[PDB]
């Protein structure tokens, strides 16, 4: 079936490579393509929000997890839908890009871990019960 670690790895590798960043640890195909196209589209529609988020993160090694948790909680405070999940992936991408910009590339591995466990444990039942990634693909692919 669907592999959350693979979904996270391919998405973060795509987003980083797209902007010229490296990630050695990253360096069913329809789900990966649909997700990255949806995330690209979201980032174009809400470019101002993304640019403001990138500017405000101010990451350090000891604060990165708290910044991640703080934004994810606000993102889903009104409930989960597919668009907020795409935003969750795009935010992870922004977290990874800013980690490298602050000379903290090792954080990319941690962020990828946090995203994977969020899918595995926090979002898993919602995704499964609302049709899984196959429904996401039929809706937006
Ligand atoms: C602290 C913060 C919380 C503050 C706020 C923000 C920014 N906010 C986050 C929430 N946000 C949302 C949330 C839900 C929806 C939505 O409509 N939901 S929906 O009805 O389920 C759905 C509807 C369409 C598609 N797809 C279209 C297809 C078109 C053809 O091409 C393929 C895709 C999908 N879908 O999943 O694909 C799902 C949405 O509107 C859209 C509009 N266009 C979209 N395109 C792709 C997804 C999508 C969603 C936008 C707006 C921006 C913060 C923030 C900052 C930086 C980063 Cl980095 C991240 C977050 C932080």
Author numbering: 8 to 34, 90 to 203
Lines quoted from the article behind this entry:
BCL-2 is the founding member of the pro-survival class of proteins that includes BCL-XL, BCL-W, A1/BFL-1 and MCL-1. They exert their pro-survival function by binding and restraining related members of a family of pro-apoptotic proteins—the sensors of cellular stress (the BH3-only proteins) and the effectors of apoptosis (BAX and BAK). Four or more hydrophobic amino acids on successive helical turns within the BH3 motif engage complementary pockets (P1 through P4) in this surface groove of pro-survival proteins. Venetoclax competes with pro-apoptotic BH3 motifs for BCL-2 binding, releasing pro-apoptotic proteins and allowing apoptosis in cells primed for death.
To predict potential resistance mutants a mouse model was used to induce venetoclax tolerance in cancer cells. This study identified that mutation of phenylalanine 104 (human numbering) to either leucine (F104L) or cysteine (F104C), located within BCL-2’s BH3-binding groove, rendered the lymphoma cell line resistant to venetoclax. The crystals of venetoclax complexed with BCL-2 F104L and BCL-2 WT are isomorphous. Well-defined electron density for the drug in the mutant complex structure suggests two conformations for the 4DM and acyl group of the BA moiety as in WT. The side chain of F104 separates the P2 and P4 pockets of BCL-2. The P4 pocket volume was maintained between WT and F104L structures (P4 pocket volume 380 Å3 for both WT and F104L). In contrast the volume of the P2 pocket increased with the F104L mutation as the leucine sidechain occupies a smaller volume than phenylalanine. In this structure two conformers for F112 on α3 are evident, one like WT and a second occupying some of the volume vacated by the F104L mutation. The new F112 conformation extends into the P2 pocket, packing against L104. The occupancy of F112 refined to 0.48 for the conserved conformation and 0.52 for inserted conformation, indicating that the compensation in P2 pocket volume only occurs 50% of the time and the vacated space is unfavoured. The structure of BCL-2-F104L:venetoclax presented here reveals that the P2 pocket increases in volume with the F104L mutation relative to WT (480 Å3 and 596 Å3 for WT and F104L, respectively). This increase in pocket volume decreases the surface complementarity between the drug and its target, likely contributing to the decrease in affinity.
